[PDB]
Design a protein around this ligand. Sequence first.
Ligand SMILES: Nc1ncnc2c1ncn2[C@@H]1O[C@H](COS(=O)(=O)NC(=O)c2csc(-c3nc4ccc(O)cc4s3)n2)[C@@H](O)[C@H]1O
Length: 530
Amino acid sequence: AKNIKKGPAPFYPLEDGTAGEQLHKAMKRYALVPGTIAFTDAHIEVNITYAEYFEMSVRLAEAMKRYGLNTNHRIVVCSENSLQFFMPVLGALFIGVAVAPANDIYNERELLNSMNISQPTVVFVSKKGLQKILNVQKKLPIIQKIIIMDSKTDYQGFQSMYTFVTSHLPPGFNEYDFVPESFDRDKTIALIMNSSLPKGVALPHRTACVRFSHARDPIFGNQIIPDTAILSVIPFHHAFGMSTTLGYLICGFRVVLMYRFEEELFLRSLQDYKIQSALLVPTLFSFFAKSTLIDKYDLSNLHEIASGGAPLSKEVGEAVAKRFHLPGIRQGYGLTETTSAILITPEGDDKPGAVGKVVPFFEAKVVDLDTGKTLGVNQRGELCVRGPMIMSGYVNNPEATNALIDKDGWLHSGDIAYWDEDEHFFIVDRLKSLIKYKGYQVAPAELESILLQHFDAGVAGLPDDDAGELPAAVVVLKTMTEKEIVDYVASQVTTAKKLRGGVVFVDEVPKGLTGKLDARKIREILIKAK
Ligand SMILES: Nc1ncnc2c1ncn2[C@@H]1O[C@H](COS(=O)(=O)NC(=O)c2csc(-c3nc4ccc(O)cc4s3)n2)[C@@H](O)[C@H]1O
């Protein structure tokens, strides 16, 4: 148990009450300070204050309570990042209604699969997504009501959130006398998120409360300080975006949002909102690996860039940190099933390449794939974590649940990792993404992070008769041909991790979610081509 990595005591303590109660308390305090901005749409340059956000969320909460939504119900929220997004989230948390964010770029099949699991009584949806909701709806009689989020009037026959609250809110309603519901926070679901074919990740209120400790933690999150502005290009429906933003709201920060990344706007927004901290995913670290515009703008307020969701190249990360004049890139490692990051780069405890250290209340260990024994320092194995932020289980799928989490409460991440003498953790890859040329493992990240100098590519395992797999790549180019690339690699690495059967040229590398690589799509581009 010298081989169990334990998070320290928190620097900001766990708070009583439901996630809702805590979000209510914080945002009521912030609402009472004039001019405090909750969100900012960088695109249309519009702000919404904590006072506004608070009142509308509360109205929405009460409106829902009167409509009959109780702890036994579920709503989905289906939208791109927007000013309205968190209104029905907050409303639903205040009164103990589970929120099921659904990915706003699902096709209809993916969308139907999700909602078929979350079984929502009410659907909050953006104009951009209404149509897809309408198509899948016939196969989901559970849905009783559709409500448009980003319109003020009724829209195509459906009530807006504003016409909806109108319908049920008394005229004698005072928001500041509203009291959030109280209930058991271990037993009551705050969130149902997707991970993916798809599963519903159920997250008790308690996991969010724990998140709010981390979020407010000055060492593992951000210290509450007035006039803090953050720029986030993370999808609010993903655990990354949902858990950071809710954290930022508990912290009274200004969340500057964007529903789509664009290099110029991003950069100008950092400058003009005096952004102290920006959230990215590694996929975007290319745009600053090319740079050019970044030195125009004034980024002298930026203290921090945080990445998560996918492996960040060590060189790329070091490289991009320099260009923003930052000591390093802050990192967070998490799973939808752990609610948020459980490995985080602690302030003033860096290490290039590491994803950080065990968060407060948590424990981590690396285990042997064959016997499950706990491994020691620098020993690669499967990353396991346990703590009060781990989901209560998959929705209506107890088999997958027991498959993921054991008696001792250890979650098996499917990631290969190790920790060093300083208790820093390093992610190697998904166990599934590793390639075995003889009996010898090859990690994709290792071959990708030697290609990036010669634009962008994705290494995968080209199956075989008698080797099992052969390291292969899928690449995005002014000119250099296959044999010239294979031979280039063969001059760079050792015997067994050569591209012994690689290279296929493509438009763009099949990336997904929060800038992660599709092992599948790449491993079929290659199989199709041979
Ligand atoms: N930092 C990382 N480095 C390398 N790989 C990473 C990674 N994070 C996720 N991954 C990969 O994503 C998989 C899970 O994807 S997932 O299930 O969609 N969920 C996630 O990726 C996920 C859920 S919560 C979360 C984060 N929360 C944060 C809070 C603050 C902060 O500063 C940084 C972060 S990242 N990420 C993991 O198994 C792993 O393979």
